[PDB]
Each structure stands twice: as structure tokens, then as C-alpha cells.
Point group: D2
Chain length 119, copies 4
């Protein structure tokens, strides 16, 4: 039983920047692109045997009982980046482990995946 | 012209709590209610002549040139609370003011609305 | 071997409020009360046999190999609350457990302590 | 009167990394380095005729009514960087302007300074 928690890297900084510069068009662009990119993530996960647990904009969490190629899955997630917006991931054997692994990725960089047992 | 920025209060803490307690049911519940609540927010704003600028996760930002009763709009916002999750808002004459007024609401309480001009 | 991580609750919110209201005196009061209270916590942990690992801003992290009464230690921490500013704590057998327990406290309330093995 | 708000960039991420990797030495190193650096920042501001309003770790805010070379002041701030930790700044005519300028710096880059009037 494997869990994956996926979240955008510092998307809040890009949103705040758009508010402070009065950039309506950039804010609407981010809104639309976050919605479209998290749909691509969820459908890819579904096509690879996952069950979607949580799906907001910039955040998707899922689980599977099948074996998966995490390199392939995270390569797909990396290919869904747009502009200076990327996503990180944590993998674990329950929700808490995937969440802590996700914090590990976020605290050590961007556009990376961590597996809890390997920390 | 008037801009309004709306966001949930402490939603991230409820989500974090769900991960650390291994509560899939509560996490999925939060996901569904957030998405349903922000759909209700966007539809109420569009119904009062707003153009939606941003709609993602727990935030909705919009603008209008129509006349607007803010008491009506924010009483509607307050009716969309669920469990321990409330929503705050900031209003201004541009996006920057609405954002700063939202930060004012978040920093001074829960379930409240701030007009940028009243903060000066 | 026991680790404890202590951090203020929502202190950033009180600070942001003071900036946005141009409340110079309020901000300076928070600065002083924060540094004074964290020194109080640090001296208290030393008096109960801890070694300080980290002490900065609104947080103190310490470890001990000696015997401890946790109820006495955290009741002391709660007695260091001022105005609406309080502190939460996490305890574990290593730094990661103490941190995750601290995150558990912060996400479920304020002025509370979590022991990692209890979660 | 000029207000300046200074804050470290990404300090919390370096701290979190240390907890999660069980690196006591790296966490104590950060603690010691942050405390050294905030004292250097505040002593430099005092040396330039500022009055300190707020001083925590990775964060110092001050104000002055005298003349100041901000370029010299921020050049000193940038020289206090250590490892991957840099500092950002906002300048304004009151606390709220300095804060919003600092938010502008942190959302738009690393190791930068913003003057509130330059953002309008």
C-alpha cells in the first residue's frame, strides 16, 4: 500500500507577486493553469493504477496497492510543469509518511520526490 | 471598481491534521467540501455581476463595476462555513489593496472582512 | 534520550497585525516579550537537565539523557504564555519525531504538547 | 522618517531539512549562525543611526529620521549571507509600507530590496 502526496513548489509566491503588482491577467493565468495541470496529474495517476484521495489546485494525493514505476510517474509530473511552477512529491506507506516525505522534498529543493523509508 | 479576495481560515492546519492522524476519510472530506464551497462562492459572485479573477483550492478573487451590497456578499460568504473552517475576505480598489486587506483579516481574527480604506 | 521542540503559536499573525496597523509600540512589545519568554523557557529546560540544541526567534529545541517530569516541564511552558501568545511542543526520541509531534500540536490547536509515540 | 523591515529567505526550509534528517549539528549551526547574523544586522543599523523596533532571529525592523545611504546599508546586509541563507528587505514611510515592500521582495526574488513607492 503506497501513498503519494504531490504539491506545487512555492506557488503562493507567484500568486502574491501577481497581487502586489496588480497583475490580473497573470493571476487568472495561474488559476487556469493550476486547474489544468492538476487535472493532467490526476488522470496520469489514475491511468497508472492510483486512487485519488485529495485533489485541490496545486495539491493531489493518491494511493495504490499495485506496483508502480515511481521514476516514470514522477517524470510525468515533471513534464507537466509550466513557467517557473513545478511540483514536488513524497511517497510513503501511509498518509503521515507521504506527508513527511513531501515536507522533506519541499525543504531540500524543488521539483524533487522523496520516499519516506529512504530518509 | 472593487476587488474582493476571499480565502479559508486555517484550512491548511485541518489538512495537515488529517495527514498526521492517517485520516483518509477526513482528508477526502476536506477536499470535496472545499471544492464545493468555492464553487458556491464563485456562483454567488457571478450572480452579483463580478468577474472571477482567480479560483483555486480555497481562494476566490473577483472584481466588479456594478453596485454591490458588501453586507449581503459577506453574509453569503459566512453562510458557507463548514466544520471548523471559516472564510475571510479583503476588499480594495485594486488587487494589491484587496490582498493587503485580506492579510489584515487573517492576521486579526477569523471569519472577518476588511476594507483596505478602513485600515489606513 | 528525549528531544523536545517548542515554538510559539501563530506568532506571525500577531506580528503581521502590528505591521498593518502601524502599531510600532505593539511590535516592539512583542519583540521583547518573545525574546524574554524564550529565554525563560531555555533557562527552565537547563534547570531540568536539558541541553539546548536550537534557540532562535519564537522556538527552543533541547534534548536530555537524564530523567524528566514532562507534566512539570510543559506546565511551566504554559505558565510562560503572555497576552494571546502561547507555545506548543513536540517530544520524540530524535529530532524528526520531536518535529513531527510539534507539527501535530500546531495543526490541532494551541498551547498543547504532543508525544510522537502517542500519535 | 524611513522604516526598514529585513527578513531571511528560506530560513525555515533549512531548519526543517535539519529536523527531518536528524542532523543535530546542522540545526545547532543554523541556530548559532542566525543569532550571529541578526546581531550583525542590528548593530549595522544602529551604526547607521537607526532605532531598532523589532529583533528576532532572521528578522530585524528599524526606523530612522536621519539621512541614510540605503545602498551601503543593504550591501552590508547582503554580505551577511551564509550558506544558502540570504536576506530580503522592504523600505517605506511607515511600518505597513515597509512590510508590504518586504512581501514584494520575498515574493519576487531572493536577496533583494524593495522601496514601497517603487511598487505603485
Amino acid at each position: 500500500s503506497m501513498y503519494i502526496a504531490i504539491d506545487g513548489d512555492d506557488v503562493g509566491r507567484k500568486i502574491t507577486s501577481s497581487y502586489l503588482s496588480n497583475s490580473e491577467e497573470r493571476l487568472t493565468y495561474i488559476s487556469n493553469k493550476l486547474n489544468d495541470t492538476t487535472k493532467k496529474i490526476s488522470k496520469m495517476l489514475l491511468s497508472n493504477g492510483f486512487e485519488i484521495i485529495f485533489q485541490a489546485a496545486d495539491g493531489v494525493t493518491a494511493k495504490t496497492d499495485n506496483e508502480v514505476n515511481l521514476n516514470f510517474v514522477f517524470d510525468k509530473i515533471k513534464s507537466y510543469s509550466f513557467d517557473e511552477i513545478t511540483f514536488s512529491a513524497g511517497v510513503g506507506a501511509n498518509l503521515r509518511e507521504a506527508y513527511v516525505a513531501l515536507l522533506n522534498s519541499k525543504s531540500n529543493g524543488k521539483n524533487m520526490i522523496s520516499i519516506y523509508k529512504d530518509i
